[PDB]
Amino acid sequence: AQYEDGKQYTTLEKPVAGAPQVLEFFSFFCPHCYQFEEVLHISDNVKKKLPEGVKMTKYHVNFMGGDLGKDLTQAWAVAMALGVEDKVTVPLFEGVQKTQTIRSASDIRDVFINAGIKGEEYDAAWNSFVVKSLVAQQEKAAADVQLRGVPAMFVNGKYQLNPQGMDTSNMDVFVQQYADTVKYLSEK
Structure with a gap:
C-alpha cells in the first residue's frame, strides 16, 4: 500500500477510547519540538489539511527538564486556559533552548508578562483549580498512551505518527508528507 x-x-x-481527534505532545526542552514549532510549523500545516469538524489538541509533558519541566506543564495549562498559546510558545522555546534565560518559574512568568498577560491574571490562573485539572488532563493523556518520547502526534487515540519513516532531504516535502499522513489517518 x-x-x-x-x-x-x-x-x-x-x-485509547474517547481520545482527542488530533493529539500532539511536546516539551519546551525537546529539540525536535523546537524545529516542529519554529522551522517546520507542523501543527499549522496539519491544520490546513485537516477536514471540517476536526479539533486539534497539544499538550506539554513532564518527563524532560525535571522541576522546570513540570513548571512548564503548569504554565502551558495557564496558556491554554487564557488562550495565549500563540503568544508564549515561541518565547518559551527560545528562552529554554536558545537564550537560556528560563531557569525558574519566575522566569517563565516573565515571558507571560512580556507577552502582555497581567501579573495578577497569570498568578490567579497559575493557582486556579481549573489549571490544576488542565494539568491533570495533560498527564492523563500522556499516561493513556505510553508516552516516553516527544514530539508525538496521535490520531483518534489509535494511530501514532512515525516521522522517522519519511524523507528529510527537503523540509517542505517532509512537512507535506506528515500532514498528508495525518489527513489519511483521520479519514481511516
Missing part, C-alpha cells in the same frame, strides 16, 4: 503501518505511522496495541 502507499501508507503502511510501521512506515509513516504505527498502531497502538492498546487503542
